[PDB]
Write a protein that binds this ligand. Structure first.
Ligand SMILES: *C(=O)C/C=N/[C@@H](C(=O)O)[C@](C)(Cn1ccnn1)[S-](=O)=O
Ligand SMILES: [Cl-]
Length: 262
């Protein structure tokens, strides 16, 4: 409706930044879109695609998720809450996937990237899903710079919502692998202040947040509203000032606006 559009435009104006929203309502294959074809830096929301690429690879490599990966001091980057505990030992690729998705561990993301063949291999995976917009170009920590005008490590809200639908609700992944991705995302520990904060307490959410330079504040989610078919929601947000603070409340407000009535 124009109503939801006016409300998102007002939210964007109040926030002072640039807001991108894509909601897919699977009850009727409908969408609510706001700047949904513009590019935004994904930041840690890209961890979903890296984990999914590993899961895809595991469909033909049944030992992949159990493969042991050494964690070294030389791997630490910024923000390694889980990997720090395992320095000089190994973690399995399953453990690294869980750490990347549930604690936003950056070392874990770098190991996923390395074990599928680098950023361009994650991008090639996206192309196999029919996503010709996503691009992963750097490793952690630099993929989060989020400089205005820089297309590196960006996607659009529309593309990411469609891809998330395919990964979590469709059959881009096999039965076991899709269930694993959804279980990992439902177990996220870092998302309560973002999309979830704009939804009723009873709704079930699997999400992945991200943040970065220019006050970039993001969340992507699969949502099961009480007694309704699932939704996919992408909320991306970025600001004009390099040192702007995160605005998770803007994502919560966007979620409340677009799910009002559901
Ligand atoms: C996922 O979104 C991980 C984001 N990490 C960045 C952040 O939280 O802002 C870090 C910690 C800080 N940063 C801002 C710009 N470039 N980096 S990045 O160092 O991991
Ligand atoms: Cl409630």
């Amino acid at each position: 409706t124009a109503d939801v559009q006016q409300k998102l435009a007002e939210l964007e104006r109040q926030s002072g930044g640039r807001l991108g929203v894509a909601l897919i309502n699977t009850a009727d294959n409908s969408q609510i879109l706001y700047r949904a074809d513009e590019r935004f830096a994904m930041c840690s929301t890209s961890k979903v695609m890296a984990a999914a690429a590993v899961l895809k690879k595991s469909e033909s490599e049944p030992n992949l998720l159990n493969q042991r990966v050494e964690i070294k001091k030389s791997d630490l980057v910024n923000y390694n809450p889980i990997a720090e505990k395992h320095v000089n030992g190994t973690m399995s690729l399953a453990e690294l996937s869980a750490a990347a998705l549930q604690y936003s561990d950056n070392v874990a993301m770098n190991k996923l990237i390395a074990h599928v063949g680098g950023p361009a291999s994650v991008t090639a995976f996206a192309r196999q899903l029919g996503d010709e917009t996503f691009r992963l170009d750097r490793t952690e920590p630099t993929l989060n710079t989020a400089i205005p005008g820089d297309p590196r490590d960006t996607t659009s809200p529309r593309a990411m919502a469609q891809t998330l639908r395919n990964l979590t609700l469709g059959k881009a992944l096999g039965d076991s692998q899709r269930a694993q991705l959804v279980t990992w995302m439902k177990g996220n520990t870092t998302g309560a202040a973002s999309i979830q904060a704009g939804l009723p307490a009873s709704w079930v959410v699997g999400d992945k947040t991200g943040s970065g330079g220019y006050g970039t504040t993001n969340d992507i989610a699969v949502i099961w509203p009480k007694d309704r078919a699932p939704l996919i929601l992408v909320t991306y947000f970025t600001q004009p000032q390099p040192k702007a603070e995160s605005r998770r409340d803007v994502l919560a407000s966007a979620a409340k606006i677009v799910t009002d009535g559901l």
